[PDB]
Amino acid sequence: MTRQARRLYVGNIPFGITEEAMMDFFNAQMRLGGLTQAPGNPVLAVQINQDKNFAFLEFRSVDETTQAMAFDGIIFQGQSLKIRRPHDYQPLPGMSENPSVYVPGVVSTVVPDSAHKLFIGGLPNYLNDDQVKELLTSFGPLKAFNLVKDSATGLSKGYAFCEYVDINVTDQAIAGLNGMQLGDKKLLVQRASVGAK
């Protein structure tokens, strides 16, 4: 079966989201983004594990599944959706593994360790993914971003990682944010290599 090549993991889903709302969101986004490859819905079903905070999407075609990987990081009800292959996915012969389209405004959640990867610590815990992304985007467009959540409670842990499109924005964000006081917290903004364990 092509079935594992027609399914995607979606993490960090909004609390209380229904399977139908998730399906409507992705079917509409696929059509609006020009990713859908025929009339009708590309997403057939959604299974939510509400307790563990993830969903699986099932698509009608291998190719539309691949294109939907381009939605990684899309904001849905304030949250950056983490879109991933199933762990047992294996590319089929002759079928592409990576998406061929770009979705304007969608920022990847995949932030690899790299020279200019930034750590941002001390963020107020009431800021959602969208608001932290907006804070960072004020300095320049992002290539990648993730805000770290507690996997049991879903609450922000108050620190994030990001990578700017322009490597030179990195030091501008550091200058603008490092050491800023918010309540009892003080932002630490530095390249993530500096304080990694």
Side-chain angles (χ1 to χ4, degrees), residues 2-14 16-51 53-89 91-95 97-183 185-197:
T2 56
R3 182 157 184 265
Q4 286 308 89
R6 289 188 294 98
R7 261 151 75 70
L8 294 178
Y9 164 94
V10 185
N12 189 40
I13 59 174
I17 197 76
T18 68
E19 288 174 349
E20 313 89 78
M22 286 269 296
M23 200 156 44
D24 285 358
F25 177 76
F26 275 99
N27 278 325
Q29 282 283 343
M30 290 278 295
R31 178 81 51 195
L32 288 159
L35 310 195
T36 187
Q37 287 181 5
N41 292 340
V43 181
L44 302 177
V46 175
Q47 288 87 49
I48 292 173
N49 186 321
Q50 317 268 3
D51 179 34
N53 185 227
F54 69 87
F56 271 80
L57 315 179
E58 182 157 336
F59 293 80
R60 66 178 173 190
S61 73
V62 166
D63 281 344
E64 287 166 313
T65 302
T66 296
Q67 298 293 74
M69 288 284 290
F71 287 124
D72 178 52
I74 188 164
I75 293 293
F76 185 39
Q77 299 184 8
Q79 310 220 151
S80 315
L81 298 185
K82 317 303 185 58
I83 302 181
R84 303 284 184 279
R85 293 289 185 178
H87 286 331
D88 62 2
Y89 161 77
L92 309 164
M95 306 298 288
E97 153 145 37
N98 302 113
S100 73
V101 182
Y102 166 76
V103 179
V106 170
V107 177
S108 174
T109 64
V110 176
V111 195
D113 292 353
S114 77
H116 304 292
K117 175 174 178 173
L118 265 187
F119 169 81
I120 308 97
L123 295 161
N125 60 37
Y126 53 78
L127 297 171
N128 64 19
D129 300 342
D130 192 39
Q131 289 298 313
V132 179
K133 187 171 70 63
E134 196 63 35
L135 174 73
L136 297 169
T137 297
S138 63
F139 294 93
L142 290 165
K143 188 177 294 135
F145 162 79
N146 74 291
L147 174 65
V148 178
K149 308 299 192 47
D150 186 291
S151 47
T153 64
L155 302 175
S156 174
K157 288 177 110 172
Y159 56 93
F161 301 86
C162 76
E163 181 185 353
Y164 284 101
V165 169
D166 178 5
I167 68 171
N168 301 304
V169 173
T170 311
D171 285 340
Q172 301 174 351
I174 290 167
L177 298 172
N178 187 42
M180 189 171 289
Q181 185 75 47
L182 309 160
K185 289 180 185 176
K186 186 176 170 177
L187 300 187
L188 178 57
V189 182
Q190 66 190 13
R191 282 170 177 83
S193 61
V194 170
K197 344 296 190 210

Coordinates of all heavy atoms in Angstrom, one line a residue, residues 80-159, unseen atoms left out:
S80 N 2.2 27.1 15.7 CA 3.0 26.6 14.5 C 2.8 25.1 14.4 O 3.3 24.3 15.2 CB 4.5 26.8 14.7 OG 4.8 28.1 15.2
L81 N 2.2 24.6 13.3 CA 2.0 23.2 13.1 C 3.3 22.6 12.6 O 3.9 23.0 11.7 CB 0.9 23.0 12.1 CG -0.5 23.5 12.5 CD1 -1.5 23.1 11.4 CD2 -0.9 23.0 13.9
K82 N 3.7 21.5 13.3 CA 4.9 20.7 13.0 C 4.4 19.6 12.0 O 3.8 18.6 12.4 CB 5.5 20.1 14.2 CG 5.6 21.0 15.4 CD 6.3 22.2 15.1 CE 6.6 23.1 16.3 NZ 7.4 22.5 17.4
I83 N 4.8 19.7 10.7 CA 4.4 18.7 9.7 C 5.6 17.8 9.4 O 6.7 18.3 9.1 CB 3.9 19.4 8.5 CG1 2.6 20.2 8.9 CG2 3.5 18.3 7.5 CD1 2.0 20.9 7.7
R84 N 5.4 16.5 9.6 CA 6.5 15.5 9.5 C 6.0 14.3 8.7 O 4.8 14.0 8.8 CB 7.0 15.1 10.8 CG 7.5 16.3 11.7 CD 8.9 16.8 11.3 NE 9.4 17.8 12.2 CZ 9.1 19.1 12.2 NH1 8.2 19.5 11.3 NH2 9.6 20.0 13.0
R85 N 6.9 13.6 8.1 CA 6.6 12.3 7.6 C 6.4 11.3 8.8 O 7.0 11.4 9.9 CB 7.8 11.7 6.8 CG 8.1 12.5 5.5 CD 7.0 12.2 4.5 NE 7.3 12.8 3.2 CZ 6.5 12.7 2.1 NH1 5.4 12.0 2.1 NH2 6.9 13.4 1.0
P86 N 5.5 10.3 8.6 CA 5.5 9.1 9.5 C 6.9 8.5 9.6 O 7.7 8.5 8.6 CB 4.6 8.2 8.8 CG 3.7 9.0 7.8 CD 4.7 10.1 7.4
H87 N 7.3 8.1 10.8 CA 8.6 7.5 11.0 C 8.9 6.3 10.1 O 10.1 6.1 9.8 CB 8.8 7.2 12.5 CG 9.0 8.4 13.4 ND1 9.5 9.6 13.0 CD2 8.7 8.5 14.7 CE1 9.6 10.4 14.0 NE2 9.1 9.7 15.1
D88 N 7.9 5.6 9.7 CA 8.1 4.4 8.9 C 8.0 4.7 7.4 O 8.0 3.8 6.5 CB 7.2 3.2 9.3 CG 5.8 3.5 9.1 OD1 5.4 4.6 8.7 OD2 5.0 2.6 9.5
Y89 N 7.8 6.0 7.0 CA 7.7 6.4 5.6 C 9.0 6.0 4.9 O 10.1 6.3 5.4 CB 7.4 7.8 5.5 CG 7.7 8.4 4.1 CD1 6.9 8.2 3.1 CD2 8.8 9.2 3.9 CE1 7.1 8.8 1.8 CE2 9.1 9.8 2.7 CZ 8.3 9.6 1.7 OH 8.5 10.2 0.5
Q90 N 8.9 5.5 3.7 CA 10.0 5.3 2.8 C 9.6 5.8 1.4 O 8.4 5.4 0.9 CB 10.4 3.8 2.7
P91 N 10.4 6.6 0.7 CA 10.0 7.0 -0.6 C 9.8 5.8 -1.5 O 10.5 4.9 -1.5 CB 11.2 7.9 -1.0 CG 11.8 8.4 0.2 CD 11.5 7.4 1.3
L92 N 8.7 5.9 -2.4 CA 8.5 5.0 -3.4 C 9.4 5.3 -4.6 O 9.9 6.4 -4.8 CB 7.0 5.1 -3.9 CG 6.0 5.0 -2.7 CD1 4.6 5.5 -3.1 CD2 5.9 3.6 -2.2
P93 N 9.7 4.3 -5.5 CA 10.5 4.6 -6.6 C 9.8 5.5 -7.6 O 8.6 5.3 -7.9 CB 10.8 3.2 -7.2 CG 10.3 2.2 -6.2 CD 9.2 2.9 -5.4
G94 N 10.5 6.5 -8.1 CA 9.9 7.4 -9.1 C 9.1 8.5 -8.5 O 8.7 9.4 -9.3
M95 N 8.8 8.5 -7.2 CA 8.0 9.6 -6.6 C 8.9 10.4 -5.8 O 9.8 10.0 -5.0 CB 6.9 8.9 -5.7 CG 6.0 7.9 -6.4 SD 5.0 8.6 -7.7 CE 3.8 9.6 -6.9
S96 N 8.7 11.8 -5.9 CA 9.5 12.7 -5.2 C 9.3 12.7 -3.7 O 8.2 12.4 -3.2 CB 9.3 14.1 -5.7
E97 N 10.3 13.0 -2.9 CA 10.2 13.0 -1.4 C 10.0 14.4 -0.9 O 9.4 14.6 0.2 CB 11.5 12.4 -0.8 CG 11.9 13.0 0.6 CD 12.5 11.9 1.5 OE1 13.3 11.1 1.0 OE2 12.2 11.9 2.8
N98 N 10.4 15.5 -1.6 CA 10.4 16.8 -1.1 C 9.4 17.7 -1.9 O 9.2 17.5 -3.1 CB 11.8 17.4 -1.0 CG 12.8 16.6 -0.3 OD1 13.7 16.1 -0.8 ND2 12.5 16.5 1.1
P99 N 8.8 18.6 -1.2 CA 7.8 19.5 -1.9 C 8.5 20.4 -2.9 O 9.6 20.8 -2.8 CB 7.2 20.3 -0.7 CG 8.2 20.3 0.4 CD 8.8 18.9 0.3
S100 N 7.7 20.7 -4.0 CA 8.3 21.5 -5.1 C 7.7 22.9 -5.1 O 8.2 23.7 -5.9 CB 7.9 20.8 -6.4 OG 6.5 21.0 -6.7
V101 N 6.9 23.2 -4.2 CA 6.3 24.6 -4.1 C 6.6 25.2 -2.8 O 7.0 24.6 -1.8 CB 4.7 24.5 -4.3 CG1 4.1 25.9 -4.3 CG2 4.4 23.8 -5.6
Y102 N 6.5 26.5 -2.8 CA 6.7 27.4 -1.6 C 5.4 28.0 -1.3 O 4.6 28.4 -2.2 CB 7.8 28.4 -1.8 CG 7.8 29.5 -0.8 CD1 8.4 29.3 0.5 CD2 7.3 30.8 -1.1 CE1 8.4 30.3 1.4 CE2 7.4 31.8 -0.2 CZ 7.9 31.6 1.1 OH 7.9 32.6 2.0
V103 N 5.0 28.1 0.0 CA 3.8 28.6 0.5 C 4.1 30.0 1.1 O 4.8 30.0 2.1 CB 3.1 27.7 1.5 CG1 1.8 28.4 2.0 CG2 2.8 26.4 0.9
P104 N 3.7 31.1 0.5 CA 4.2 32.4 1.0 C 3.8 32.6 2.4 O 2.7 32.3 2.9 CB 3.4 33.4 0.1 CG 3.2 32.6 -1.2 CD 2.9 31.2 -0.7
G105 N 4.8 33.1 3.2 CA 4.6 33.5 4.6 C 4.7 32.3 5.6 O 4.7 32.6 6.8
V106 N 4.9 31.1 5.1 CA 5.0 30.0 6.0 C 6.5 29.8 6.3 O 7.3 29.8 5.4 CB 4.4 28.7 5.4 CG1 4.8 27.5 6.2 CG2 2.9 28.8 5.3
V107 N 6.8 29.7 7.6 CA 8.1 29.6 8.2 C 8.3 28.2 8.7 O 7.6 27.8 9.6 CB 8.4 30.7 9.2 CG1 9.8 30.6 9.8 CG2 8.2 32.1 8.7
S108 N 9.3 27.5 8.2 CA 9.6 26.2 8.6 C 9.9 26.1 10.2 O 10.3 27.1 10.8 CB 10.9 25.7 7.9 OG 11.4 24.5 8.4
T109 N 9.5 25.0 10.8 CA 9.8 24.8 12.2 C 11.1 24.0 12.4 O 11.5 23.8 13.5 CB 8.8 23.9 12.9 OG1 8.7 22.6 12.4 CG2 7.4 24.6 12.8
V110 N 11.8 23.6 11.3 CA 13.0 22.9 11.3 C 14.2 23.8 11.4 O 14.5 24.5 10.5 CB 13.1 21.9 10.1 CG1 14.5 21.2 10.1 CG2 12.0 21.0 10.1
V111 N 14.8 23.9 12.6 CA 15.9 24.9 12.9 C 17.1 24.1 13.1 O 17.4 23.7 14.3 CB 15.6 25.8 14.0 CG1 16.6 27.0 14.0 CG2 14.1 26.4 14.0
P112 N 17.9 23.7 12.1 CA 19.1 22.9 12.4 C 20.2 23.7 13.1 O 20.3 24.9 12.9 CB 19.6 22.5 11.0 CG 18.5 22.9 10.1 CD 17.8 24.0 10.7
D113 N 20.9 23.1 14.0 CA 22.1 23.7 14.5 C 23.0 24.2 13.3 O 23.2 23.5 12.3 CB 22.9 22.7 15.4 CG 22.2 22.3 16.7 OD1 21.2 22.8 17.0 OD2 22.8 21.4 17.4
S114 N 23.4 25.5 13.5 CA 24.1 26.1 12.4 C 24.8 27.4 13.0 O 24.5 27.8 14.1 CB 23.2 26.5 11.2 OG 22.5 27.7 11.5
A115 N 25.6 28.0 12.2 CA 26.4 29.2 12.6 C 25.5 30.3 13.3 O 25.9 30.8 14.3 CB 27.2 29.8 11.5
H116 N 24.4 30.6 12.6 CA 23.6 31.8 13.0 C 22.3 31.4 13.6 O 21.4 32.2 13.8 CB 23.4 32.7 11.9 CG 24.8 33.2 11.3 ND1 25.6 34.0 12.1 CD2 25.4 32.8 10.2 CE1 26.7 34.1 11.4 NE2 26.7 33.4 10.3
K117 N 22.1 30.1 13.9 CA 20.9 29.7 14.7 C 20.9 30.5 16.0 O 21.9 30.5 16.8 CB 20.9 28.2 15.0 CG 19.8 27.7 15.9 CD 19.8 26.2 16.0 CE 18.8 25.6 16.9 NZ 18.8 24.1 16.7
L118 N 19.8 31.1 16.4 CA 19.6 31.9 17.6 C 18.8 31.2 18.7 O 17.8 30.5 18.4 CB 18.9 33.2 17.2 CG 19.6 34.5 16.9 CD1 18.5 35.6 16.8 CD2 20.7 34.9 17.9
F119 N 19.2 31.4 19.9 CA 18.5 31.1 21.1 C 17.9 32.4 21.6 O 18.6 33.4 21.7 CB 19.4 30.4 22.1 CG 18.7 30.3 23.5 CD1 17.9 29.2 23.7 CD2 19.0 31.2 24.5 CE1 17.3 29.1 25.0 CE2 18.4 31.1 25.7 CZ 17.6 30.0 26.0
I120 N 16.6 32.3 22.0 CA 15.8 33.4 22.6 C 15.2 32.9 23.9 O 14.2 32.1 23.9 CB 14.8 34.0 21.7 CG1 15.4 34.4 20.4 CG2 14.1 35.2 22.4 CD1 15.2 33.3 19.3
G121 N 15.8 33.2 25.1 CA 15.2 32.7 26.3 C 14.6 33.8 27.2 O 15.0 34.9 27.0
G122 N 13.8 33.4 28.1 CA 13.1 34.4 29.0 C 11.9 35.0 28.5 O 11.4 36.1 29.0
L123 N 11.2 34.4 27.5 CA 10.0 34.9 26.9 C 8.8 34.8 27.9 O 8.7 33.7 28.5 CB 9.7 34.2 25.6 CG 10.7 34.5 24.5 CD1 10.5 33.4 23.4 CD2 10.5 35.9 23.9
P124 N 8.0 35.8 28.0 CA 6.7 35.6 28.8 C 6.0 34.4 28.3 O 5.8 34.2 27.1 CB 6.0 36.9 28.5 CG 7.0 37.8 28.1 CD 8.1 37.1 27.4
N125 N 5.5 33.6 29.3 CA 4.9 32.3 28.9 C 3.5 32.4 28.3 O 2.9 31.5 27.7 CB 4.8 31.4 30.1 CG 4.0 32.0 31.3 OD1 3.0 32.6 31.1 ND2 4.5 31.7 32.5
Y126 N 2.8 33.6 28.4 CA 1.6 33.8 27.7 C 1.7 34.1 26.2 O 0.7 34.3 25.5 CB 0.8 35.0 28.4 CG 1.6 36.2 28.5 CD1 1.7 37.1 27.4 CD2 2.2 36.6 29.7 CE1 2.5 38.2 27.5 CE2 2.9 37.8 29.8 CZ 3.0 38.6 28.7 OH 3.8 39.7 28.8
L127 N 2.9 34.2 25.7 CA 3.0 34.5 24.2 C 2.9 33.2 23.5 O 3.6 32.2 23.8 CB 4.4 35.2 23.9 CG 4.6 36.5 24.6 CD1 6.0 37.0 24.4 CD2 3.6 37.6 23.9
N128 N 2.1 33.2 22.5 CA 2.0 32.0 21.7 C 3.0 32.0 20.5 O 3.7 33.0 20.3 CB 0.5 31.8 21.1 CG 0.1 32.9 20.2 OD1 0.8 33.6 19.6 ND2 -1.3 33.0 20.0
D129 N 3.0 30.9 19.8 CA 4.0 30.8 18.7 C 3.9 32.0 17.7 O 5.0 32.5 17.3 CB 3.7 29.5 17.9 CG 3.8 28.3 18.7 OD1 4.4 28.3 19.8 OD2 3.3 27.2 18.2
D130 N 2.7 32.4 17.4 CA 2.5 33.5 16.4 C 3.1 34.8 17.0 O 3.7 35.5 16.2 CB 1.0 33.6 16.1 CG 0.7 34.5 15.0 OD1 1.5 34.5 14.0 OD2 -0.3 35.3 15.1
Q131 N 2.8 35.1 18.2 CA 3.3 36.4 18.8 C 4.8 36.4 18.9 O 5.5 37.4 18.7 CB 2.7 36.7 20.1 CG 1.2 37.0 19.9 CD 1.0 38.3 19.1 OE1 1.7 39.3 19.3 NE2 0.1 38.2 18.1
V132 N 5.4 35.3 19.3 CA 6.9 35.2 19.3 C 7.5 35.3 17.9 O 8.5 36.0 17.7 CB 7.4 33.9 20.1 CG1 8.9 33.9 20.1 CG2 6.9 33.9 21.5
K133 N 6.8 34.7 17.0 CA 7.3 34.8 15.6 C 7.3 36.2 15.1 O 8.2 36.7 14.4 CB 6.6 33.8 14.7 CG 7.1 33.7 13.3 CD 6.5 32.6 12.5 CE 5.0 32.9 12.1 NZ 4.9 34.1 11.2
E134 N 6.2 36.9 15.4 CA 6.0 38.3 15.0 C 7.1 39.1 15.7 O 7.7 40.0 15.0 CB 4.6 38.8 15.5 CG 4.2 40.0 14.8 CD 4.1 39.9 13.3 OE1 3.7 38.8 12.8 OE2 4.4 40.9 12.6
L135 N 7.4 38.9 16.9 CA 8.5 39.6 17.6 C 9.8 39.5 16.8 O 10.5 40.5 16.6 CB 8.7 39.1 19.0 CG 9.9 39.6 19.8 CD1 9.6 41.1 20.2 CD2 10.2 38.8 21.0
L136 N 10.1 38.3 16.4 CA 11.4 38.0 15.8 C 11.4 38.6 14.3 O 12.4 39.1 13.8 CB 11.7 36.5 15.8 CG 11.9 36.0 17.2 CD1 11.9 34.4 17.1 CD2 13.2 36.5 17.8
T137 N 10.2 38.4 13.7 CA 10.1 38.9 12.3 C 10.2 40.4 12.2 O 10.5 40.9 11.1 CB 8.7 38.4 11.7 OG1 8.7 37.0 11.7 CG2 8.5 39.0 10.3
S138 N 10.0 41.1 13.3 CA 10.2 42.6 13.2 C 11.6 43.0 12.8 O 11.8 44.0 12.2 CB 9.8 43.2 14.5 OG 10.7 42.9 15.5
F139 N 12.6 42.1 13.1 CA 14.0 42.4 12.7 C 14.2 42.0 11.2 O 15.1 42.6 10.6 CB 14.9 41.7 13.6 CG 14.8 42.3 15.0 CD1 14.0 41.7 16.0 CD2 15.6 43.4 15.3 CE1 13.9 42.3 17.2 CE2 15.5 44.0 16.6 CZ 14.6 43.4 17.5
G140 N 13.5 41.0 10.7 CA 13.7 40.6 9.3 C 13.0 39.3 9.1 O 12.7 38.6 10.1
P141 N 12.9 38.8 7.9 CA 12.2 37.6 7.6 C 12.9 36.4 8.1 O 14.1 36.3 8.1 CB 12.1 37.6 6.0 CG 12.3 38.9 5.6 CD 13.1 39.6 6.6
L142 N 12.1 35.4 8.6 CA 12.7 34.2 9.1 C 12.8 33.1 8.1 O 11.8 32.9 7.3 CB 11.9 33.7 10.3 CG 11.9 34.5 11.6 CD1 10.8 34.1 12.5 CD2 13.3 34.4 12.3
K143 N 13.8 32.3 8.2 CA 14.0 31.0 7.5 C 13.4 29.9 8.3 O 12.8 28.9 7.7 CB 15.4 30.7 7.2 CG 15.7 29.5 6.3 CD 17.2 29.4 6.0 CE 17.8 30.6 5.2 NZ 19.1 31.2 5.7
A144 N 13.5 29.9 9.6 CA 13.0 28.9 10.4 C 12.8 29.4 11.9 O 13.5 30.3 12.3 CB 13.9 27.6 10.4
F145 N 11.9 28.7 12.6 CA 11.5 29.2 13.9 C 10.8 28.0 14.7 O 10.0 27.4 14.1 CB 10.6 30.4 13.9 CG 9.8 30.7 15.1 CD1 10.4 31.3 16.2 CD2 8.5 30.3 15.2 CE1 9.7 31.5 17.4 CE2 7.8 30.6 16.4 CZ 8.4 31.2 17.5
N146 N 11.1 27.8 16.0 CA 10.3 27.0 16.8 C 10.4 27.5 18.3 O 11.4 27.8 18.8 CB 10.7 25.5 16.8 CG 12.1 25.2 17.5 OD1 13.1 25.5 17.1 ND2 11.9 24.3 18.5
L147 N 9.2 27.6 18.8 CA 9.0 27.9 20.2 C 8.8 26.7 21.0 O 8.0 25.8 20.6 CB 7.8 28.9 20.4 CG 7.3 29.2 21.8 CD1 8.3 30.0 22.6 CD2 6.0 29.9 21.8
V148 N 9.6 26.5 22.1 CA 9.6 25.2 22.8 C 8.4 25.2 23.8 O 8.2 26.1 24.6 CB 10.9 25.0 23.5 CG1 10.9 23.7 24.3 CG2 12.0 24.9 22.5
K149 N 7.6 24.1 23.7 CA 6.5 23.9 24.6 C 6.8 22.7 25.5 O 7.5 21.8 25.2 CB 5.2 23.5 23.8 CG 4.8 24.5 22.7 CD 4.6 25.8 23.3 CE 3.9 26.7 22.3 NZ 2.8 26.1 21.5
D150 N 6.1 22.7 26.7 CA 6.0 21.5 27.5 C 5.1 20.5 26.8 O 4.0 20.7 26.5 CB 5.5 21.9 28.9 CG 5.5 20.7 29.8 OD1 4.8 19.7 29.6 OD2 6.3 20.7 30.8
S151 N 5.7 19.3 26.6 CA 5.0 18.2 25.8 C 3.8 17.6 26.6 O 3.0 17.0 26.0 CB 5.9 17.2 25.3 OG 6.8 16.7 26.4
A152 N 3.8 17.8 27.9 CA 2.7 17.2 28.7 C 1.6 18.2 28.9 O 0.4 17.9 28.9 CB 3.3 16.8 30.1
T153 N 1.9 19.5 29.1 CA 0.9 20.5 29.4 C 0.6 21.4 28.2 O -0.5 22.1 28.2 CB 1.4 21.5 30.5 OG1 2.5 22.2 30.1 CG2 1.7 20.7 31.8
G154 N 1.4 21.4 27.2 CA 1.3 22.3 26.0 C 1.6 23.7 26.3 O 1.3 24.6 25.4
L155 N 2.1 24.1 27.4 CA 2.4 25.5 27.8 C 3.8 25.8 27.2 O 4.7 25.0 27.2 CB 2.3 25.7 29.3 CG 1.0 25.4 29.9 CD1 1.1 25.5 31.4 CD2 -0.1 26.3 29.4
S156 N 3.9 27.1 26.8 CA 5.3 27.6 26.5 C 6.3 27.5 27.6 O 6.0 27.8 28.7 CB 5.2 29.1 26.1 OG 6.5 29.5 25.8
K157 N 7.5 27.0 27.3 CA 8.6 27.0 28.2 C 9.4 28.3 28.1 O 10.4 28.4 28.9 CB 9.5 25.8 27.9 CG 8.8 24.5 28.3 CD 9.7 23.3 27.9 CE 10.3 22.6 29.1 NZ 10.9 21.3 28.7
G158 N 9.0 29.3 27.4 CA 9.5 30.6 27.4 C 10.9 30.7 26.7 O 11.6 31.6 27.0
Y159 N 11.2 29.8 25.8 CA 12.4 30.0 24.9 C 12.1 29.4 23.6 O 11.3 28.5 23.4 CB 13.6 29.4 25.6 CG 13.6 27.9 25.9 CD1 14.1 26.9 25.0 CD2 13.2 27.5 27.2 CE1 14.1 25.6 25.4 CE2 13.2 26.1 27.5 CZ 13.6 25.2 26.6 OH 13.7 23.9 27.0

